[PDB]
Write an enzyme that holds these catalytic residues in place. Structure first.
Site, mmCIF file in Angstrom:
data_model
loop_
_atom_site.group_PDB
_atom_site.id
_atom_site.type_symbol
_atom_site.label_atom_id
_atom_site.label_comp_id
_atom_site.label_asym_id
_atom_site.label_seq_id
_atom_site.Cartn_x
_atom_site.Cartn_y
_atom_site.Cartn_z
ATOM 1 N N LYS A 142 0.834 -1.198 0.000
ATOM 2 C CA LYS A 142 0.000 0.000 0.000
ATOM 3 C C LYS A 142 0.885 1.271 0.000
ATOM 4 C CE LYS A 142 -2.658 2.617 3.390
ATOM 5 N NZ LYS A 142 -2.809 2.716 4.871
ATOM 6 N N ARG A 175 -4.031 10.550 5.110
ATOM 7 C CA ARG A 175 -2.680 10.934 5.516
ATOM 8 C C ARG A 175 -1.705 11.084 4.352
ATOM 9 N NH1 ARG A 175 -1.965 10.762 10.905
ATOM 10 N NH2 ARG A 175 -3.573 9.680 12.149
ATOM 11 N N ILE A 206 5.975 22.924 12.652
ATOM 12 C CA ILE A 206 6.387 23.271 11.296
ATOM 13 C C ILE A 206 6.498 21.994 10.444
ATOM 14 C CG2 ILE A 206 8.151 24.402 9.893
ATOM 15 C CD1 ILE A 206 8.830 26.115 12.405
ATOM 16 N N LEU A 226 7.754 19.606 7.551
ATOM 17 C CA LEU A 226 9.008 19.412 6.786
ATOM 18 C C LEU A 226 8.880 19.445 5.253
ATOM 19 C CD1 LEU A 226 9.010 16.376 5.423
ATOM 20 C CD2 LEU A 226 9.495 15.636 7.762
ATOM 21 N N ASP A 235 7.639 -0.932 12.240
ATOM 22 C CA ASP A 235 6.352 -1.544 11.815
ATOM 23 C C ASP A 235 6.212 -3.051 12.057
ATOM 24 O OD1 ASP A 235 5.060 0.870 11.229
ATOM 25 O OD2 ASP A 235 5.582 0.837 9.092
ATOM 26 N N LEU A 240 10.916 7.051 21.004
ATOM 27 C CA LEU A 240 9.850 7.761 21.712
ATOM 28 C C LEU A 240 9.038 8.653 20.772
ATOM 29 C CD1 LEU A 240 11.911 8.656 24.921
ATOM 30 C CD2 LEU A 240 9.958 7.075 24.824
#
Ligand SMILES: [Cl-]
Lengths: 431, 417
Positions: free
Chosen positions: B24, B94, B124, B126, B306, B328
């Site tokens: 995907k 997304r 901000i 990227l 993942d 983190l």
């Protein structure tokens, strides 16, 4: 943590800083109260049945916005000379669709106290929540463990039910999540046990204030807290002062170091800068502490440093950029190992234009210090990067210009006045 | 068409074959890249998931002529008109920010909605700073990005390794004026395929597969695309491997590239499982005893974050103590595994797993795709019948997930909540 939108890019109305380099510094700089402590401490007045007095409060945009949100919900407020008066006796929540955006950003801290005290609370789903996905920043799972009933029904997240104590594990070290759940546990029924709790001094102060206000809490300063909830009873708050801003302090120290100058900081707690002082020592700078004050002495030669960011009390990611700037003056190669979580190296490109020799290899920056830095026109980004560019400018040859200072002004008050009093040649001009 | 959940009986043993679908995360940038094609683009081995359909429909709304059937898409952006792309199906997507680069580069301006994505606090961005370095004028009015200006080549440094940022800027550089040099570029196979396709389509690009790319922009000239197949989904593959391992069963994967799972295969080996590769297929053999593992997540080609949750689940069956060191939240699956009797302790960003204890079935709430995969695996190895609720993130990530586990012998069934 942040109280407004991405207004950073709106550069129609704006100012910049012109900084002349290679000027030795001298004098004293008073450290202000920590913005990150003040925010949770103001949200905590939701748990006070009486008038709460808070001192040493920085006069910045996020503080004002928060106060104004509490006023909109009924709280009676006052704020002058870095001192605030809070009384939430008349606090009531408004219909789910009133002060929409303000309540959405502040929900990462207010959700807990409001659900606990009032029995329900509604926050708007941000734009980007596909059918089903709940906001992961709110600690919705945490509140469900405490008996809360959560649902998504009209574009809002609707929380309800009476909170009860339970053992809660934080999936990751989170400063705001800790503060949000500490305040929820404070009023819940019974004992709450928190695990993998952030140890930052900001979290520690919150706990100290609540303890001083009558709440039974154990494990303060550790990563494991035990809270006996007041079962809906509000607390008797006592007056206190917000802790000094350790990041601000760290930044003035780097200013003194990068100019290899003797300077002194007032209204500062050295105990909250252990990792930072140790690294300044590793680079040849002697530290000298006398309770609420720190004095930095010049080094014979600035030595290279190896830094790896980690959670408190380790080296803070919020000082990483200021140290990268200082490493440019070190006689040798320095190494800075960061976390691949939210850019973090935005300041690198701008330092390259000042002649810096910096190479990025994934999440690790290699600095080859020694080169003379040249002045330049640089574009600042976040608070972290903004601090680093000002420092580099003070040590570079020529007159630099630091543009896009939106994040810097929202982070520090009277920033010019402080650098000016230390002898720095800085001036603000209209863009 | 309401919410559903999965009922999974703790399986004794699996067997058979599972075909791995097309990635995907590769397909999304490859479809956005048809914005750079003057003629018809053919793309095969495309997973039939929600995000794919939404993206295709966005391109249709902008003028593109499209078709999508049997995991094969036809794209022709000859008629692609306006660059105004501010809908709500797009807001929630997304991967929609991937279009900003191609559209601004080709058409000189574009308006896209900020994705956001359930987080209260945001950055901000990227992507925006990167496009400014190429001469773009950016502005934020409401929750939309208004981009404009002609793009020119430049040396761009990525502040952090970003898969989508790389893809977004690679496509922008493709049509900009002059030479672009990208530094600290993500090396993921998804980024690599994008580059290969563009190279095969006539773009001068050097350093493919490395963290440093050199791109000679076509100065607005569109490219001649050639038909291709999307690469296999390495995460999906990794997850079927963990299913075979956690049940300590012999299974085989088809239409899979072992080269994209080297870190994952090495860890399965460290735990006693033999791997066997033959062309586009992998066969997993049971272990005598499942051994503990130490994992540290990192950027490709290191161990992928993942797959971290699926390995935490497998470490529960290991005879000993395992360690997982993460960046983190990323440990949302931990609480639900504790209710299945797991012995897991978090110390900051490091999880210690004490495997061996028998897992018991439970009623659990899934969260992200990562956590969702881990809970299904744990359920297969636990005693009793588990129920995995809130599978909305899982269904948007994989098609016919039940049918694949069913064909491997797992007792899974979908019920209406
Ligand atoms: Cl190449």
């Amino acid at each position: 943590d942040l109280g407004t939108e991405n207004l950073y890019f709106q550069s129609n109305a704006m100012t910049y800083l012109e900084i002349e380099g290679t000027n030795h510094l001298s004098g004293n700089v008073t450290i202000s109260g920590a913005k990150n402590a003040a925010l949770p401490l103001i949200v905590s007045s939701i748990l006070a049945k009486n008038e709460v007095k808070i001192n040493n409060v920085p006069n910045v945009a996020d503080i004002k916005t928060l106060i104004s949100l509490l006023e909109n919900l009924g709280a009676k407020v006052n704020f002058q000379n870095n001192s605030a008066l809070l009384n939430t006796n008349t606090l009531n929540q408004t219909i789910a669709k009133y002060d929409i955006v303000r309540k959405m950003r502040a929900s990462i801290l207010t959700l807990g106290p409001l659900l606990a005290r009032f029995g329900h609370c509604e926050v708007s789903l941000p734009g980007g929540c596909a059918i089903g996905q709940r906001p992961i920043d709110l600690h919705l799972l945490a509140l469900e463990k405490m008996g809360a009933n959560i649902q998504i029904k009209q574009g809002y997240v609707v929380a309800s039910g009476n909170l009860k104590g339970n053992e809660i594990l934080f999936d990751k070290i989170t400063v705001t999540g800790s503060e949000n759940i500490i305040m929820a546990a404070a009023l819940a029924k019974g004992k709450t046990k928190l695990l993998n709790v952030a140890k930052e001094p900001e979290v520690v102060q919150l706990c100290e204030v609540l303890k001083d206000a009558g709440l039974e809490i154990k494990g303060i300063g550790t990563d494991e807290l035990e809270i006996y909830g007041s079962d809906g009873e509000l607390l008797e708050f006592k007056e206190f002062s917000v802790i000094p801003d350790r990041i601000e302090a760290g930044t003035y120290l780097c200013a003194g170091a990068i100019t290899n100058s003797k300077i002194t900081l007032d209204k500062v707690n050295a105990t909250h800068l252990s990792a930072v002082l140790a690294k300044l020592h590793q680079m040849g700078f002697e530290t000298l502490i006398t309770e609420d004050s720190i004095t930095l002495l010049p080094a014979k030669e600035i030595k290279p440093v190896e830094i790896m960011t980690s959670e408190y009390p380790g080296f803070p990611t919020d000082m990483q950029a200021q140290f990268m700037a200082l490493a440019l003056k070190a006689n040798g190669t320095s190494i800075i190992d960061e976390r691949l979580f939210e850019n973090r190296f935005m300041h690198v490109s701008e330092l390259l234009r000042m002649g810096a020799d910096i190479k990025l290899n994934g999440h690790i920056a290699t600095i080859v210090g020694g080169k003379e830095l040249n002045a330049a026109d640089v574009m600042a980004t976040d608070l972290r990067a903004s601090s680093a560019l000002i420092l580099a400018a003070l040590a570079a040859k020529g007159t630099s210009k630091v543009h896009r200072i939106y994040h810097l002004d929202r982070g520090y008050e009277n920033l010019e006045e402080k650098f000016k009093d230390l002898g720095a040649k800085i001036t603000r001009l209209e863009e």
